[PDB]
């Protein structure tokens, strides 16, 4: 079976909106349009998108839900396609999604554990089991528990399939680099053909027992995704055989950091010959400037975003664990803090502190 | 610590008709149509503790004259040292009486009275809280239109509220005095093998004079505390900045430049001269930062309708920085009625009409 697997489009994004707004439109529309074509071309039996297909989950766009169903609507033409919304899809979409499915048969929502039972365009039989992103919402152990107990039920479900088993899940598996609920790869039951994942922007190879993929987003939504991959995949599956694939290439416009210490005249100049003929966007990030590069940004327009290197010894409190904390503040009490600054300026004597320590818990008797 | 509320009950007071509710740890958001009796709830904390709200000068102003039965009742229950205490206030304004009672509860339904008058009420309350009225509203409690106070305060008003929030200055004062009568009767005990006991008791008395020193000139050690746990506030508060303005925002403490002092891209700015917005997002990190520092201390944290100047973009940045406050089981109400800003969080009280739908 021949199958288009995509995800993560993002439709209805703007770029930088505080900053130099970019809307990607355009960019992704392309990307998107080169996506359909060869999947007409391969004239694949099955698609299926794995959510965050819309940008925003609250206000959507006209024009990106226009362009949603249109695109739908096209990959529909060429073959059954088959939709697992993320946590990033507009909440209405299911909706319509539900709506939808009990009208077409080239069209279904899966927006539950449920498993569905559906057949491709040679009538090859698929048994989708999903698994949604995982609402946030011990506690976290229950719902570990209660999400064990929905990953068994897949699997006693994937043993029932006729000729196909594929699996589609929205969420992040451990390893990679906050608040969600990280999911191991070895929970995602084996006995599946494939393994569809999205929610995650760079294409990944998962595991290859089960064939576990996110072919990542479409174009680069922000820096960190500079050196990763954009596309979809293209994935064949055949019951006695092993399962191959294929990255399909986007080929998104490109996005590059220019690092800094100094922006003196030196570095003006190569932020301009940088920035020149760049058919993509362009970020600098600095230690000190001179009021140059906001002015600078200005007249540069491809330069979308400037950034101060913001300081370790300020990155860290953030991160810093529920363990350095008490730790903190609990050395911020008016008398352990009262400790190094009389071991500070007479050093010597402690019995000062052995002296003050029986005469706080003398008065914390009256 | 470690205070923290537990019942408001209202009835007749401001916008409000009855309402009563209880507390949670986290974050609840209480919204509801303008002139429903969300800033309301808010005040009746503020009249409950100190007999005072933001927003009228005299008691029976505060009386709800859109009831017929024109009398105000607040019970208000908070904690603090594993004790409970409730506070029972009423207004009249047809009397204009103000009745004010304070008592602990206990082992079951009972009761031991503190105060009843009013002036001994608010007396014993700070006594309890340990901070004053106006450390109330510049910390944990930020009255509508009045997010950025501590922000643009003067630095004396500063410090004078850092060490009320993180001193024990009861501790101190009880302190202070057991060593004035521990010099004095060893001073004493001087002006009267007899070298050696005089050795010891001499000993002990210069350590006494030591241990008063350096915890009693106050532009020393006093200086030097305020100075050590502000910079843990605004160390914390620069990293909220860094994450909500690309770290083109930065902010400091200096007490001869006057306070706070706010740069753009390394430009000093005067509060007054930044965008409403900007203004709104500063002062919220320096309080939400001041929260965490003051974990332990304080157990709750209230804003009322501080969000609105805030544009789409900043309203999720700033919901998401502010479930970062989730972790601290600490009492959290925001008070809005905006829907994106609430979109984000779980868990509504809905006031309409004086009353919870
Ligand atoms: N003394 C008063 N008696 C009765 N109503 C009052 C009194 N003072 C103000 N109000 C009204 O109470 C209502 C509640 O105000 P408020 O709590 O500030 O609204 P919001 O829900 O927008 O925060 C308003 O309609 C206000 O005008
Ligand atoms: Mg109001
Ligand atoms: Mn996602
Ligand atoms: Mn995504």
């Not at chain 1, 011990?138 to 719902?143: I, Q």
Request: glycine share 6%; net charge neutral.
């Amino acid at each position: 079976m021949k199958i288009l697997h995509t995800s993560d489009w993002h439709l209805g994004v703007t770029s930088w909106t505080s900053s130099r707004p970019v809307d990607r439109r355009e960019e992704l529309k392309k990307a998107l349009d080169k996506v359909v074509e060869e999947a007409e071309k391969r004239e694949v039996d099955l698609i299926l998108l794995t959510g965050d297909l819309l940008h925003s989950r609250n206000n959507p766009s006209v024009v990106a839900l226009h362009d949603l169903l249109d695109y739908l609507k096209r990959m529909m033409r060429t073959a059954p396609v088959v939709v697992l919304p993320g946590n990033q899809d507009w909440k209405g979409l299911k909706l319509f999604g539900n709506f939808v499915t009990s009208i077409s048969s080239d069209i279904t929502f899966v927006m539950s554990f449920e498993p569905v039972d559906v057949e491709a365009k040679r009538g090859q039989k698929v048994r989708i089991l999903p698994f949604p992103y995982p609402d946030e919402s011990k506690n976290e152990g229950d719902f570990r528990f209660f999400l064990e107990s929905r990953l068994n039920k897949l699997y006693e479900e994937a043993l029932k399939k006729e000729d196909f088993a594929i699996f589609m899940g929205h969420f992040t598996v451990e390893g990679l680099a906050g608040r969600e609920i990280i999911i191991n790869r070895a929970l995602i039951p084996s006995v599946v053909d494939y393994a569809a994942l999205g929610h995650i922007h760079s294409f990944r190879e998962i595991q290859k027992q089960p064939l576990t993929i996110y072919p990542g987003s479409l174009i680069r939504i922000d820096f960190g995704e500079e050196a990763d991959e954009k596309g979809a995949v293209f994935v064949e599956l055949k019951r006695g055989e092993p399962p191959r694939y294929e990255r399909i290439d986007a080929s998104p416009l490109p996005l590059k950091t220019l690092y800094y210490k100094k922006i003196d005249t030196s570095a003006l100049k190569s932020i301009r010959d940088s920035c020149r003929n760049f058919p993509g966007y362009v970020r600098v990030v600095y230690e000190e400037d001179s009021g140059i590069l906001p002015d600078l940004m200005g007249e540069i327009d491809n330069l979308v975003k400037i950034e101060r290197k913001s300081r370790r010894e300020i990155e860290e409190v953030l991160r810093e664990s529920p363990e350095e904390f008490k730790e903190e503040l609990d050395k911020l009490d008016y008398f352990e803090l009262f400790k190094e600054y009389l071991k500070k300026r007479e050093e010597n004597h402690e019995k000062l502190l052995k002296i003050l320590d029986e005469l706080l818990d003398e008065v914390k008797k009256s | 610590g470690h205070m923290r509320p537990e019942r408001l009950t209202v009835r007749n007071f401001l916008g409000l008709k009855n309402v009563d509710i209880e507390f949670q740890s986290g974050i609840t958001v209480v919204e509801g149509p303008n002139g429903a009796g969300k800033s309301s709830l808010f005040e009746a904390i503020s009249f409950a503790l100190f007999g005072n709200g933001i927003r009228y000068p005299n008691s029976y102003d505060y009386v709800n004259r859109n009831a017929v039965d024109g009398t105000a009742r607040l019970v208000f229950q908070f904690e603090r040292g594993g004790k409970r205490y409730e506070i029972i206030r009423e207004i009249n304004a047809l009397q204009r009486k103000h009745n004010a009672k304070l008592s602990e509860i206990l082992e079951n339904g009972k009761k031991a009275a503190i105060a009843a008058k009013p002036t001994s009420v608010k007396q014993e309350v700070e006594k309890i809280l340990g901070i004053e009225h106006r450390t109330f509203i510049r910390t944990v409690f930020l009255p509508q239109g009045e997010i950025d106070k501590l922000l643009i305060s003067p630095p004396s008003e500063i410090t004078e509220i850092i060490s009320d929030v993180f001193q024990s200055k009861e501790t101190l004062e009880k302190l202070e005095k057991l060593l004035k009568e521990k010099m004095k009767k060893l001073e004493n005990e001087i002006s009267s093998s007899l070298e050696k006991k005089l050795k010891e008791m001499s000993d002990e008395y210069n350590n006494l004079d030591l241990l008063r020193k350096y915890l009693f000139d106050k532009s020393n050690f006093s200086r030097y505390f305020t100075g050590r746990v502000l910079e843990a506030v605004l160390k914390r508060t620069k990293a909220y900045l860094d994450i909500l303005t690309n770290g083109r925002f930065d902010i400091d403490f200096d007490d001869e430049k006057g306070g706070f002092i706010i740069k753009d891209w390394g430009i000093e700015r005067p509060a007054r001269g930044l965008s409403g917005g900007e203004r709104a997002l500063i002062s919220i990190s320096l309080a939400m930062s001041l929260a965490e520092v003051a974990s332990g201390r304080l157990d709750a944290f209230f804003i009322d309708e501080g969000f609105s100047s805030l544009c789409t973009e900043n309203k999720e940045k700033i919901a998401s920085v502010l479930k970062e406050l989730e972790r601290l089981n600490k009492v959290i109400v925001f008070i809005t009625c905006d829907r994106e800003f609430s979109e984000a969080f779980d868990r509504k009280l809905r006031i309409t009409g004086g009353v919870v739908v």
